[PDB]
Amino acid sequence: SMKIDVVTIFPEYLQPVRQSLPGKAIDAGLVDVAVHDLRRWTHDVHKSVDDSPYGGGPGMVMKPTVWGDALDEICTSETLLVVPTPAGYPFTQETAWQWSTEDHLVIACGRYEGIDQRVADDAATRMRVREVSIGDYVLNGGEAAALVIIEAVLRLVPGVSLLEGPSYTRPPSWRGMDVPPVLLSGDHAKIAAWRAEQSRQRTIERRPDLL
Amino acid sequence: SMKIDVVTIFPEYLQPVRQSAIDAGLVDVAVHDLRRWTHDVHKSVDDSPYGGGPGMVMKPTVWGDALDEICTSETLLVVPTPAGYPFTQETAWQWSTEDHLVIACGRYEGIDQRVADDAATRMRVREVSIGDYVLNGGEAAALVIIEAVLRLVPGVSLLEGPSYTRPPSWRGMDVPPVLLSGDHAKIAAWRAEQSRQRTIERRPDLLGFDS
Ligand SMILES: OB(O)c1ccc2cc[nH]c2c1
Ligand SMILES: OB(O)c1ccc2cc[nH]c2c1
Known part of the structure; x- marks a missing residue:
């Protein structure tokens, strides 16, 4: 019912969630999460995924040619492309509810100083693209944000105001x-x-x- | 030099944290199974809520014994919860100079409120929300907090605009x-x-504008 593809240079980071899926949901074909190493789509023997920023500055920027090939292979016209970034629109419970009825999410995990902006701009000419921030803090890359998004969305998939106050149980x-x-x-x-x-x-x- | 202890009933979920800093050795992170501190043969950690409601609440007895052993008066006890104060970049800077963080990860419908109240008689306690969405437990929040904090440890506003690299x-x-x-x-x-x-x-x- 929902397929999620995650693309990252650290595929081991996503092993936790894969294992944590309920067996009954996978068996019933309600959900499938696949993780892909971005370096599969590199062009050179050094497997380069980053390069220096135009206009100068610190850090590095992820290469558009590598990301474009990866997304060309993995995405289709029905894909919702999710790009975690500290500069994104806020990801909230309302967002999670909306995405819970999607057929196909692809989550593009960046590192360093982010992904060349032409990747998202090109993708948006043939699919829906959503750049999102999970909170007002800076991480090293998008992988921990992908874990949060996957958990918040999938727990709302059928099958798989004010703050709440204190809770209590035994002993009295x-x-x-x-x-x-x-x-x-x-x-x-x-x-x-x-x-x-x-x-x-x-x-x-x-x-x-x-x- | 920082030490981080994480307490959880799903220790295997915390292994993405081997994305190190730990290799450098200025920070040490250890993960503990809450069930280590139980006594019955069935290792029960949860019970139905007083006053009614859906789900289960984690018992204070097991948590009290675990924190007794791991915490000192100098510890900052961190408790992820959707009902917490917001965790922001400012929080990350503040916690980056602490000697000892202990992160208590809940499951089910949360932890009996007396655990945090008892701990606060001996140490500093912080209940925090990493964003306005609901997870299945505190473990993914722990990973987000560790990453945001560790990248600021010595020895390791406005939104960023778009970035670009080759080809032009x-x-x-x-x-x-x-x-x-x-x-x-x-x-x-x-x-x-x-x-x-x-x-x-x-x-x-x-x-300073609406929405
Ligand atoms: O703070 B976060 O939401 C975040 C997301 C993606 C990237 C890529 C490089 N740094 C990142 C940080
Ligand atoms: O949404 B979260 O920030 C969060 C944190 C802790 C627990 C424990 C049970 N559900 C939880 C959710």
């Missing part, structure tokens, strides 16, 4: 701290009102932006 | 001519404008 008293007595009261309308107020307080303290 | 013409698409001009002032000005242009389109909040 632990290291001098008792579970809030209202949760043991059997008054379920009161419990719901108590949880709402805990959620309001936590949102004011930790995420005033949400209000 | 590819598939009929040209690198912006100013980047080939060798005029540092004109290049700096073009780049500044591309960045502010990308920021208003993708992240207007960074410049």
Whole structure:
């Protein structure tokens, strides 16, 4: 039902998620995740994936000729091409819900100072392209962002406001701290009102932006 | 010199962290199986929630014993959660000069709140969200935090605009001519404008605008 292809110079980084897929979902053909080494599409004996930036500056830029060949082979007209980058649109739960009904995601993982912009611009003339940031911080490359996106999207695939407040379980008293007595009261309308107020307080303290 | 301890019921999920820094040896990262601290033959770590609700909650008893052994009063205890304070670049800079991080990874519907409250009587505790989306547990968040922090350890605003490298013409698409001009002032000005242009389109909040 959904195919995900990931392209990276560090394919071992994605082995965790591959193994973590439920066997029943793979057997039922609901999901398939494949990982590809970008160096398969290099042109030279030194397997070069990067080169110096035009206009000067620090670091290196990933080569358009290598990426163009990789995406030509892996993508089709139905592909949603996902490019993690700290300069992207924000990736949120709404994004995850939208992508959860797609037939084919391809995730292009960059390194160094990113991928030559002509790769995305060319791809966008024949498929849908989405440059996205998973948060306001800088990573070394796109692989950890790909793990986050794969997890958040696939858990919404059929088969595979305010902040939530505190949770409790047994025992009822632990290291001098008792579970809030209202949760043991059997008054379920009161419990719901108590949880709402805990959620309001936590949102004011930790995420005033949400209000 | 930093030490990072990660506690989880899925230690195998943390092996992408062998993308080193660790090789250099200024940082040490160790992964611990929470089930090591259980006592029953079935190694139970979870129980149904007080007050009702779907799912299960991780028991405080097992976590308390694990953290007793791993943490000291100097530890910064990090707890990934969708209900946390935001983890940002500023957070990453702050944590980059810490001697000891311990990252407690939850599963199910999270960890009994008394674990963090008890720990806070002895050490500094930080509940944090890496972004506005829901994962299946804290492990992918741990990987994101480790990468954002370690790249800042000594010895290791606006959005970045587009980058380019050779060849100067590819598939009929040209690198912006100013980047080939060798005029540092004109290049700096073009780049500044591309960045502010990308920021208003993708992240207007960074410049104090709606949405
Ligand atoms: O911070 B991140 O979202 C991110 C994503 C992709 C690349 C490529 C090179 N650095 C990157 C950082
Ligand atoms: O979305 B996340 O930031 C996150 C973090 C921890 C847990 C534990 C259970 N679900 C979780 C989700």
